[PDB]
Amino acid sequence: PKYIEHFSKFSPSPLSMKQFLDFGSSNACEKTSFTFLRQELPVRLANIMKEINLLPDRVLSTPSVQLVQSWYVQSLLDIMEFLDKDPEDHRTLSQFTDALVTIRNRHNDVVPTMAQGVLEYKDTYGDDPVSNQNIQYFLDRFYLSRISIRMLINQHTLIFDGAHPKHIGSIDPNCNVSEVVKDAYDMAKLLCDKYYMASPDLEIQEINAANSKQPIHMVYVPSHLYHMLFELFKNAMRATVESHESSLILPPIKVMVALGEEDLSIKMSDRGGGVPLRKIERLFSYMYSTAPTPLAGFGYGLPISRLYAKYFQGDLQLFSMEGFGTDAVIYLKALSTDSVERLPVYNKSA
Amino acid sequence: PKYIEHFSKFSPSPLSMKQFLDFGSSNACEKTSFTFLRQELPVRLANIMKEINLLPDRVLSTPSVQLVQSWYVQSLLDIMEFLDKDPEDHRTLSQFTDALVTIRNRHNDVVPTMAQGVLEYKDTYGDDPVSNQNIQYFLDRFYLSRISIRMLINQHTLIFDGAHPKHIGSIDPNCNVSEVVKDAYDMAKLLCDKYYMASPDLEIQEINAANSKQPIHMVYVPSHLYHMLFELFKNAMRATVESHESSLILPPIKVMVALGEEDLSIKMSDRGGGVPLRKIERLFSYMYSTAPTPLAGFGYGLPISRLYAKYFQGDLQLFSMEGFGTDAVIYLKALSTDSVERLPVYNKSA
Ligand SMILES: CCNc1cc(F)cc2c1NC(=O)[C@@]2(CC)N1CCC[C@@H](NC(=O)C2CC3(C2)CN(C#N)C3)C1
Ligand SMILES: CCNc1cc(F)cc2c1NC(=O)[C@@]2(CC)N1CCC[C@@H](NC(=O)C2CC3(C2)CN(C#N)C3)C1
Ligand SMILES: CC(C)c1ccc(COc2ccc(CC(=O)NCCN)cc2Cl)cc1
Ligand SMILES: CC(C)c1ccc(COc2ccc(CC(=O)NCCN)cc2Cl)cc1
């Protein structure tokens, strides 16, 4: 496919936080966002479509991968319509925003569509370790690519609608980390109360190393941070509740927010009994998380949460002590200059 | 080299804890240990010598690798003298024990000898990442092999000297984990007091999941557990002291000993300011730990401690929060049936 082949010759251009903040500082930069995205979105779509086509035929030919690939073919065609158009025509800009909303919605069902493909592979070819590794390699890259494409689209559509805001699209330049922790906790608690008629309490501490008195803020995408905390909270709560059937008191879930020179770290700690070290890694596996529903443990929340952390050069790690409980740490870049998109690239090595 | 070539055709035979306990249950099993070790020790020496010879000539030909390789050649010759000898002659057994003590001592200087080779490589060829990875791959395998050879020799010489003990050579079948934690702490404290005129206190908690009241015991090699805890304590203490120059009170170092169905986990926690996630892995690097001396931070204590944990199927992991402090977790098998030697093998894939 030459249209795919043309744009897949380009590498995606990762943006920093600063670069994102400049695009949406003004409404005058809408021409700049359009001429940039009408090139960069085809580049990122084509790069992931090229990788989809490297899949063995027994995966490529299944209905779910064909369905998803047909969406990416259509979204590419939608955008390379605007390549010749003139940026000075306001009807070209508004139709461009329109076409982005259509593309975003078209792809809204990708996560359970791919999971249906995983389920079929497990039943048609099996769940050996080499299959697990290849599913994991592919879906990590596919989903991280999709996160990055969605980020670009949100930044354009949220900013250029039609007038000097605090939030810049999906970026909050003064994100109060502890408030997002509490929001995600409250939401998980609401679900956990409905499921189990009980829920652990929350304790938050902050360590702002350089300024011990200042509440910890950062530049970040709070919906991503919410997503990660919410998924971790549901897990911590289920583990706490189900390991204390015989206890009257549930241990709280504790959160420590630490700000260092380079890292902003968020540790969540439960006393939910923990798991043996041998079983930690499978918790991040798409294959083992796919089955044919409890508060936590199934679906792709945990591995996708790790990709959100990785997207701006962070990480998400799990540490448990069997018989006691489990820690989860989200590591984020403390400095906006260090927060740069992490994109999968289609090099020959891949 | 055919003598090397003959024995390197065999794979090392990893032993379990149970198997070690049976060899030294009796004094009658000395014939059995001799006929076993006079085959198995050449197998393990030849396997590591074969790998030493796979090193590129610019590494192989340096004086320190030639020196170490000459020791392994001599130790192999010492043992394949006993291949024809008769196990029923007590003079054959006693001379065998004798020859093991000579072999163990001959190799006593390997760690700083290899480090001298690392230092020369860094100055003669450089410290690029690919060099780092190959040094790390080689030395992890070389040192783990050496730990296993030393384990076999200690079990023979400590048990068969010349009468129904609690300890079985270097194995304690009723190792009180918390007592070893305190021993290692006391020793590190002694050094830290001399260095800095101050030291953090120690707090220990135990979680024995199945039996909440019982002190936690396990079958293990307590000198190995001591080695690991001692190295971690020196690090935790230096970090605590040097991050609190302006404070009057030093935070304690906290230890949690947890016993689960499969894992026995030992978490050590300091408030020594922590390090950015990006710098954790280099703490395990032989290359970055080699320089041309503080309480902690130089030399190979940390990566060798991880190999001790790995030797009977455990692990040692570091988790830090920049601006606050650092956790270290030793993971050990809780069940003696699961505690099996982990040996490097000379497969074609290696
Ligand atoms: C402080 C943050 N706490 C935390 C965070 C986590 F992300 C995970 C956990 C915690 N605490 C936990 O105890 C853990 C595991 C470390 N636990 C939470 C409860 C759900 C449980 N999930 C399972 O058992 C799934 C594995 C299958 C279900 C998939 N099926 C197949 N095949 C079996 C994982
Ligand atoms: C609760 C257990 N605490 C713990 C355990 C650890 F194993 C390590 C640490 C801790 N706490 C710590 O803060 C840490 C790091 C996570 N820290 C201890 C103090 C010494 C410091 N070492 C360095 O800076 C070396 C790196 C070079 C010196 C090599 N040179 C080169 N090139 C620079 C490491
Ligand atoms: C549905 C999606 C998520 C999905 C489902 C299933 C898979 C599984 O993908 C595999 C499985 C095995 C191999 C080995 C192989 O054949 N190598 C090539 C040997 N010539 C390669 C791949 Cl890409 C991926 C993605
Ligand atoms: C002194 C000891 C510890 C030591 C010191 C230094 C080293 C470094 O070893 C290297 C360095 C680079 C390469 C790349 C290479 O040349 N590959 C082969 C390409 N044909 C291979 C090896 Cl085995 C090992 C062990």
Side-chain angles (χ1 to χ4, degrees), chain B residues 54-336:
Chain B
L54 295 182
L55 294 165
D57 183 53
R58 68 189 181 273
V59 175
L60 189 52
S61 73
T62 63
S64 55
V65 178
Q66 285 303 280
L67 184 63
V68 163
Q69 190 184 170
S70 69
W71 292 343
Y72 277 83
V73 170
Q74 188 68 81
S75 297
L76 181 54
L77 299 179
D78 289 354
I79 295 185
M80 47 193 286
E81 291 275 316
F82 294 81
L83 281 171
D84 65 326
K85 293 258 170 71
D86 180 28
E88 314 298 326
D89 192 326
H90 295 219
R91 299 184 73 95
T92 296
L93 298 186
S94 65
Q95 289 161 27
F96 183 74
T97 307
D98 274 321
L100 288 193
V101 179
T102 307
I103 284 155
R104 196 219 307 104
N105 298 333
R106 181 181 291 123
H107 292 245
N108 264 331
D109 285 337
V110 169
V111 172
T113 296
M114 296 297 293
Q116 180 57 29
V118 173
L119 192 41
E120 298 177 359
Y121 185 87
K122 287 181 60 175
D123 297 318
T124 52
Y125 293 105
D127 56 2
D128 56 289
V130 172
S131 298
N132 178 59
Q133 294 177 259
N134 282 283
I135 293 165
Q136 195 76 18
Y137 181 82
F138 172 74
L139 280 182
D140 274 350
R141 291 161 64 80
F142 175 80
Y143 283 143
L144 184 57
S145 160
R146 169 178 146 98
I147 290 168
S148 84
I149 291 175
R150 295 182 106 261
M151 177 73 184
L152 292 189
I153 289 170
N154 291 327
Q155 285 311 104
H156 188 82
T157 63
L158 286 171
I159 290 173
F160 303 110
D161 38 9
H164 64 295
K166 297 182 197 152
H167 292 243
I168 305 302
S170 68
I171 298 170
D172 184 349
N174 195 40
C175 179
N176 182 332
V177 175
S178 273
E179 167 71 342
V180 177
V181 173
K182 300 175 179 118
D183 290 350
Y185 166 84
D186 289 338
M187 187 63 223
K189 169 192 176 62
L190 184 43
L191 298 172
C192 180
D193 278 349
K194 284 285 196 197
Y195 260 101
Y196 297 111
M197 329 293 155
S199 51
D201 285 346
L202 174 72
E203 302 181 356
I204 304 182
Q205 301 189 350
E206 282 193 2
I207 309 285
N208 183 339
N211 303 87
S212 63
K213 302 205 265 85
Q214 292 184 11
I216 290 169
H217 297 79
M218 64 175 312
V219 176
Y220 206 71
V221 184
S223 65
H224 290 183
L225 177 63
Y226 180 99
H227 289 331
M228 299 183 286
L229 290 168
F230 177 59
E231 291 299 324
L232 291 169
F233 273 124
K234 290 185 292 177
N235 276 285
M237 293 183 179
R238 174 179 184 206
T240 305
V241 169
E242 297 195 357
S243 63
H244 288 73
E245 314 288 36
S246 56
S247 292
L248 275 172
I249 310 153
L250 301 167
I253 293 158
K254 300 187 180 201
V255 171
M256 170 88 73
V257 182
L259 181 61
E261 292 301 305
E262 166 166 335
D263 298 358
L264 197 157
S265 313
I266 307 171
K267 178 179 268 188
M268 188 189 299
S269 298
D270 72 50
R271 295 191 186 198
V275 306
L277 175 68
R278 183 177 54 89
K279 296 180 181 179
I280 289 278
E281 163 202 76
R282 69 167 74 167
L283 295 170
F284 291 97
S285 161
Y286 301 104
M287 199 179 63
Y288 303 134
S289 304
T290 310
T293 306
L295 179 63
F298 294 83
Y300 295 166
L302 186 49
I304 287 179
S305 289
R306 187 162 66 184
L307 295 177
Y308 279 128
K310 277 176 176 160
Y311 176 46
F312 283 111
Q313 310 292 321
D315 203 357
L316 194 169
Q317 301 186 349
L318 273 185
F319 310 91
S320 182
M321 284 177 80
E322 195 199 7
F324 175 70
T326 301
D327 292 340
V329 186
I330 302 167
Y331 299 94
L332 309 174
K333 292 291 181 201
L335 305 189
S336 59

Side-chain angles (χ1 to χ4, degrees), chain B residues 23-64:
Chain B
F23 261 122
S25 70
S26 309
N27 294 12
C29 307
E30 186 175 6
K31 292 184 287 191
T32 323
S33 180
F34 163 71
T35 66
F36 169 75
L37 289 183
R38 69 177 177 173
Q39 176 70 7
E40 182 64 19
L41 286 171
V43 169
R44 295 194 188 187
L45 299 162
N47 270 268
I48 197 64
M49 294 156 72
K50 182 61 179 175
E51 187 149 348
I52 289 163
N53 295 162
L54 295 182
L55 294 165
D57 183 53
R58 68 189 181 273
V59 175
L60 189 52
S61 73
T62 63
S64 55

Side-chain angles (χ1 to χ4, degrees), chain A residues 65 177 201 296:
Chain A
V65 178
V177 175
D201 285 346

